[PDB]
Enzyme design. Sequence first.
Site, PDB file in Angstrom:
ATOM      1  N   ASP A  25       0.313  -1.001  -0.102  1.00 15.76           N
ATOM      2  CA  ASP A  25      -0.344   0.044  -0.401  1.00 15.76           C
ATOM      3  C   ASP A  25       0.809   1.193  -0.189  1.00 15.76           C
ATOM      4  OD1 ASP A  25      -1.328   1.683   0.946  1.00 15.76           O
ATOM      5  OD2 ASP A  25      -3.016   1.346   2.059  1.00 15.76           O
ATOM      6  N   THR A  26       1.444   1.565  -1.195  1.00 18.85           N
ATOM      7  CA  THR A  26       2.011   2.679  -1.034  1.00 18.85           C
ATOM      8  C   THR A  26       1.526   3.707  -0.272  1.00 18.85           C
ATOM      9  OG1 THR A  26       1.481   3.728  -3.793  1.00 18.85           O
ATOM     10  CG2 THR A  26       3.345   1.449  -3.549  1.00 18.85           C
ATOM     11  N   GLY A  27       0.928   3.805  -0.708  1.00 17.38           N
ATOM     12  CA  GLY A  27      -0.019   5.368   0.776  1.00 17.38           C
ATOM     13  C   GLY A  27      -0.821   5.809   1.147  1.00 17.38           C
TER      14      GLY A  27
HETATM   15  C1  ARQ Z   1      -2.575   3.795   7.588  1.00 15.25           C
HETATM   16  C2  ARQ Z   1      -1.975   5.061   7.506  1.00 15.25           C
HETATM   17  C3  ARQ Z   1      -2.585   6.402   8.451  1.00 15.25           C
HETATM   18  C4  ARQ Z   1      -0.232   4.834   7.252  1.00 15.25           C
HETATM   19  O1  ARQ Z   1      -1.394   5.611   6.045  1.00 15.25           O
HETATM   20  C5  ARQ Z   1      -3.041   5.056   5.314  1.00 15.25           C
HETATM   21  O2  ARQ Z   1      -4.023   5.402   5.698  1.00 15.25           O
HETATM   22  N1  ARQ Z   1      -3.265   5.612   3.780  1.00 15.25           N
HETATM   23  C6  ARQ Z   1      -4.368   6.307   2.974  1.00 15.25           C
HETATM   24  C7  ARQ Z   1      -4.070   7.278   1.939  1.00 15.25           C
HETATM   25  C8  ARQ Z   1      -3.526   8.426   2.979  1.00 15.25           C
HETATM   26  C9  ARQ Z   1      -2.413   9.079   3.305  1.00 15.25           C
HETATM   27  C10 ARQ Z   1      -1.842  10.447   4.174  1.00 15.25           C
HETATM   28  C11 ARQ Z   1      -2.366  10.702   4.830  1.00 15.25           C
HETATM   29  C12 ARQ Z   1      -4.113  10.166   5.356  1.00 15.25           C
HETATM   30  C13 ARQ Z   1      -4.167   8.572   4.374  1.00 15.25           C
HETATM   31  C14 ARQ Z   1      -4.930   4.333   1.989  1.00 15.25           C
HETATM   32  O3  ARQ Z   1      -3.587   4.444   1.751  1.00 15.25           O
HETATM   33  C15 ARQ Z   1      -5.373   3.625   3.378  1.00 15.25           C
HETATM   34  N2  ARQ Z   1      -5.963   3.513   2.570  1.00 15.25           N
HETATM   35  C16 ARQ Z   1      -5.928   2.667   0.671  1.00 15.25           C
HETATM   36  C17 ARQ Z   1      -6.899   1.907   3.115  1.00 15.25           C
HETATM   37  C18 ARQ Z   1      -7.390   0.406   2.595  1.00 15.25           C
HETATM   38  C19 ARQ Z   1      -7.472  -0.275   1.829  1.00 15.25           C
HETATM   39  C20 ARQ Z   1      -8.242  -1.806   1.543  1.00 15.25           C
HETATM   40  C21 ARQ Z   1      -9.573  -1.380   2.302  1.00 15.25           C
HETATM   41  C22 ARQ Z   1      -9.498  -0.467   3.052  1.00 15.25           C
HETATM   42  C23 ARQ Z   1      -8.471   0.567   3.493  1.00 15.25           C
HETATM   43  N3  ARQ Z   1      -8.245   4.212   2.051  1.00 15.25           N
HETATM   44  C24 ARQ Z   1      -8.562   4.100   3.177  1.00 15.25           C
HETATM   45  O4  ARQ Z   1      -8.346   3.924   4.049  1.00 15.25           O
HETATM   46  C25 ARQ Z   1      -9.428   4.945   2.645  1.00 15.25           C
HETATM   47  C26 ARQ Z   1      -9.902   5.328   3.734  1.00 15.25           C
HETATM   48  C27 ARQ Z   1     -11.673   6.705   3.434  1.00 15.25           C
HETATM   49  C28 ARQ Z   1     -12.037   6.667   2.230  1.00 15.25           C
HETATM   50  C29 ARQ Z   1     -10.580   7.072   1.492  1.00 15.25           C
HETATM   51  C30 ARQ Z   1      -9.564   6.059   1.446  1.00 15.25           C
END
Ligand code: ARQ
Lengths: 99, 99
Positions: A25-27
């Site tokens: 998860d690069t973000g």
């Molecule tokens: C875990 C953490 C805080 C280190 O990073 C993230 O949560 N990263 C986010 C993006 C981001 C970047 C910078 C600041 C804040 C958020 C995403 O990479 C996380 N991600 C993809 C997790 C995920 C994976 C699969 C299914 C569900 C969730 N996305 C989200 O959590 C998210 C939440 C709400 C709306 C959109 C994306």
Amino acid sequence: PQITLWKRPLVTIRIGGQLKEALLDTGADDTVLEEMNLPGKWKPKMIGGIGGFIKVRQYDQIPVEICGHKAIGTVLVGPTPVNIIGRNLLTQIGCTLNF
Amino acid sequence: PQITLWKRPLVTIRIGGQLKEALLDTGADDTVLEEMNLPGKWKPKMIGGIGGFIKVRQYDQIPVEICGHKAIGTVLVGPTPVNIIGRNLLTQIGCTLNF
Ligand SMILES: CC(C)(C)OC(=O)N[C@@H](Cc1ccccc1)[C@@H](O)C[N@@+](C)(Cc1ccccc1)NC(=O)c1ccccc1
């Protein structure tokens, strides 16, 4: 490793003798894993993501295996939908984005 | 690109006649952008992740230019602190994970 994105990038990891599934998860800056029991002393931490604040247990210097590559580092354990591998460990094993 | 992960993977994108910065995110299924006005009809949606759920508006057939490349498709707009390019757009530009 060449991983294409028409499907989620999901891998297997090994931690504490255990076999789990995780997402590359690069973000994510950091690595966050579901509820488990791990050896040793841990620090509390709050982390913010886009839908709000979660609370976490910080463990430092833990050995993980991702796809046959060994890594040693910090893992946060807490209430995440999936298991997440973030940049801290991805850089250890040699990961890059390409086009 | 080759893009390494010592820092966050921020690129430039153009939508409309607008200049933005945004994250290349292999952990995102979908593309999530900050509050903006766009030509056309939309529907609402609930999307969730770390911390919980936000509300969003779905637009279809949006052209976007990302780092020199054309894509076209669906953007979700709503209150994010960050612009995220998900796997739906990432595949259009030739993006791969390596290893
Ligand atoms: C875990 C953490 C805080 C280190 O990073 C993230 O949560 N990263 C986010 C993006 C981001 C970047 C910078 C600041 C804040 C958020 C995403 O990479 C996380 N991600 C993809 C997790 C995920 C994976 C699969 C299914 C569900 C969730 N996305 C989200 O959590 C998210 C939440 C709400 C709306 C959109 C994306």
